[PDB]
Amino acid sequence: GRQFGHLTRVRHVITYSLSPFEQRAFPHYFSKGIPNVLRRTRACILRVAPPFVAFYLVYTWGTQEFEKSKRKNPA
Amino acid sequence: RIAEVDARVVREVCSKYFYDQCPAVAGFGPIEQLPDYNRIRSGMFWLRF
């Protein structure tokens, strides 16, 4: 397949990296991670939730109706 | 001082300063094929040793 050195052309970009034995693996896990999780939750709740809410309502209505239909009516 | 140096001294001093140490790397130019830092660091020891 493709190989490093033949992918594309890049100019004027500097990258600074630090050794893994020099830094923390969990530096701000809770102090920064939880706000970001809430951000992503807010960002996607309106896209994901309403379909499954519609499913939940159709599920409960259909089950209630099926339960009531099996019970007989006078006359 | 030079005459004192033999093979054993070289193996000990080199192991003291090279083996399983974190290097500093500087690259300039078309360096797309320059290996990732993790791969360079893994190159500083031998699983056979």
Which ranges of A1-75 does DSSP label H, i.e. alpha helix?
33-70
User: Best of B32, B33, B38, B39 to disrupt the A interface by mutation (most A CBs within 10 Å)?
Assistant: B32
Residues of the domain holding A59: 1-75
Nearest chain A residue to B23, by CA? A19
| Elucidated via | cryo-EM
The encoded tokens of residue B5 equal 């140096």
Mind telling me how many Å the CA of A1 is from chain B's nearest CA? Answer: 15
Task: Report how far apart, in Å, the C-alpha atoms of B42 and of each of A65, B5, B26, B28, B36 are.
Answer: 66, 29, 17, 22, 10
What's the number of domains chain A is made of? 1
A10 shares contact with chain B (CB less than 8 Å): yes
Rounded CA-CA distance A12/A47 in Å is 39
